[PDB]
Amino acid sequence: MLEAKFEEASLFKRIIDGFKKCVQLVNFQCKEDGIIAQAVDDSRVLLVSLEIGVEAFQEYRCDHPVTLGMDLTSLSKILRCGNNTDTLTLIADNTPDSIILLFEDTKKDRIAEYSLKLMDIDADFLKIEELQYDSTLSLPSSEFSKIVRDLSQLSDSINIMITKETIKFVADGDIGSGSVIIKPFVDMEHPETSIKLEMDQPVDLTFGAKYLLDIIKGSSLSDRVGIRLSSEAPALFQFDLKSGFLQFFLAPKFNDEE
Amino acid sequence: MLEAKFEEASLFKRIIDGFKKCVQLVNFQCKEDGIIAQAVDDSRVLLVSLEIGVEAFQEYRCDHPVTLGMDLTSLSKILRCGNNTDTLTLIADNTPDSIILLFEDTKKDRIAEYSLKLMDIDADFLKIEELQYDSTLSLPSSEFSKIVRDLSQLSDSINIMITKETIKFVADGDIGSGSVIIKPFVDMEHPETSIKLEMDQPVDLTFGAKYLLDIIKGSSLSDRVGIRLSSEAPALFQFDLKSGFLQFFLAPKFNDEE
Amino acid sequence: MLEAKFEEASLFKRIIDGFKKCVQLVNFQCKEDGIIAQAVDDSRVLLVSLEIGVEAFQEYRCDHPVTLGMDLTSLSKILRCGNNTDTLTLIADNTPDSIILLFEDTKKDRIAEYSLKLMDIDADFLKIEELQYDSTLSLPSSEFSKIVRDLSQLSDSINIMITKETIKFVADGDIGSGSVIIKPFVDMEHPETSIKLEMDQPVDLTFGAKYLLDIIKGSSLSDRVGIRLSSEAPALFQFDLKSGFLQFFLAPKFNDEE
């Protein structure tokens, strides 16, 4: 058996929106200590990796490990079916015929029960996070989202450049160009808004804006976004959940296509 | 002559939205005691039947009966032309060249007058309400609307099932399934929200979701919705107006297409 | 050099929306005393003419005259890139390679700099305002906008008719007709809302609704709209800026196409 009760369905809804772009079908490995899920896009340049621990649920129980393969368009369709604030419960049995999603509101009446037919997916799981990235920064998710959205209208390629205490986002395109330059600082009235940066090596990488636009919709899960960039590996964009994370690994455009 | 002054145009606007889906042209029989109107969809599985009495107007006068045949797309276009709160007045003469819609706001200046060319429709009027239905229920229009909207994304056929004190809405589809189960109760703090049910015979009927989605947009006219279901007749969905009603008769899917 | 600092980017954004409809590329002549710009639509029936004086800026400096030819779709794309309240600064040099747009918010950090490649446009500048128009009226921009939007759904041609103290807007079309009749008055509690009219000659002109819909989006720049109409010239619709204007000259439909 498996019973995972979210305190508010909105968290699961936004987690799956993190995947609803950018990728199609997903395996959800539920183990005794929580849920992991991974998904690669078709061009195989962006991996989405979710980890929800037990404390991020209001209740959680998994007797044996169980893998739930799900169509994200169909699961999203099912996930529009409550309020954001209803307690959504995932329920499955030993070898799962299908997953069962059980909503419940503050008015304990009229409980709604959906069921998603589970598909079969072959689980090629990737561990591609490095130990050392060339630079690490963190900034408010809102601010990263606006930078990406704005620059995405000038060209289809956004270029992130890190020098000593200087983070430069640039898009040069046919019509024109744009450049947002941010610098590290500590806001004392609100550590909400600070911009942290550790630079071990300057970086100059360029990413497709399609994918950065995909990545920034995790802003609805975390106040802040962590960006680990490296010339030797895909870049990592991390949104921290209440004891968990949603991660986007994105490969930069190559040298000759910059 | 005919002068029918709505206190607020929004009521007429929402009544015609009740028809703007699901059907195209409509006859409006205006008699000394108010307005009736009827309209069948093309597949001839859903009838929309409106009755507005005199008291639902702020003023009403009809010397002789008169039938106003109207294109609902065109009348809707005309009906976007004020505020929701302006006093809309229908005006016609003995044998009507066309209908005249006269708006007026709280600032008695700049009055706006539209005219809709009347068409010719042959009035095949249907009296298909039964005396006894197998079961009758009533529930808040908001709640019925959310049930229908949610379940409509899983399959194109919603199945209503009434057993002793148990009302079950179910959609099973290709991707998955959903089931909302409600039970009768009396809310004392708010009779707004109660769920009434009289069951003389259990029912198990299945309706096309296209049409239930059409039906639920009468939620903007009434706090509550009344559903009379029967295996021997089309189901009746009723929204009560201030001394009147908007009714949807919907034929269930047949036995072999369930 | 040229440095023109708007106190709020929203003004420039709305000015360019005034052009984003109805016309494609535009020359902006910046001289020592401010900015002028002109643009004709393809059918050559509507001219848009902007004049921003120095006081409409929070800061302004232009050493020598300079013409900035801009793609309005591309400049609009760039103009979605801040907040409405950031101080947008236009910057160019003696002979301009391209225009530079520099945003700045209340939080003086992270300043964003865009650049629009300038095109080459041949400046056929028109001075088509008359001395005497047949009639002049002024009314709230909101009210003119609603009249146009409403009447635009009945036909594609709106007909403005001015008699002694009577301003009549009419659209007769295939489906039906509509007519808004306004009359001059002075509101004392709010000169905001008054309707002024000087009639030297009655007018009966008819305008394509495509273009009136284009014209009314200047409502976001001025509380009021001034309409000079004449049978001997294109009609002039004027929105007054804080020491400036946005003007729409629109040729009426001819006599035989009324």
Author numbering:
A (entry chain A), B (entry chain A), C (entry chain A): 1 to 258
Authors' description from the paper:
It also operates as a platform for recruitment of numerous other proteins involved in DNA replication, DNA damage repair, mismatch repair, and chromatin structure and assembly.
Retention-prone mutants PCNA-D17K and PCNA-D21K have point mutations on the DNA-interacting region of inner ring. Elg1 can physically interact with PCNA-D17K and actually shows enhanced interaction with PCNA-D21K, suggesting that accumulation of those PCNA mutants on DNA is not due to a loss of interaction with the Elg1-RLC unloader. The structures (at 2.80- and 2.85-Å resolution for PCNA-D21K and PCNA-D17K, respectively) reveal that the mutations alter the inner pore of the PCNA ring. In both cases, the PCNA pore becomes more electropositive due to the swap of a negative charge to a positive charge. For the D21K variant, we observed no significant conformational changes relative to wild-type PCNA (Cα RMSD ∼0.48 Å), indicating that the binding of PCNA partner proteins should not be perturbed. The PCNA-D21K mutant provides an excellent tool for testing how PCNA retention on DNA affects cellular function.
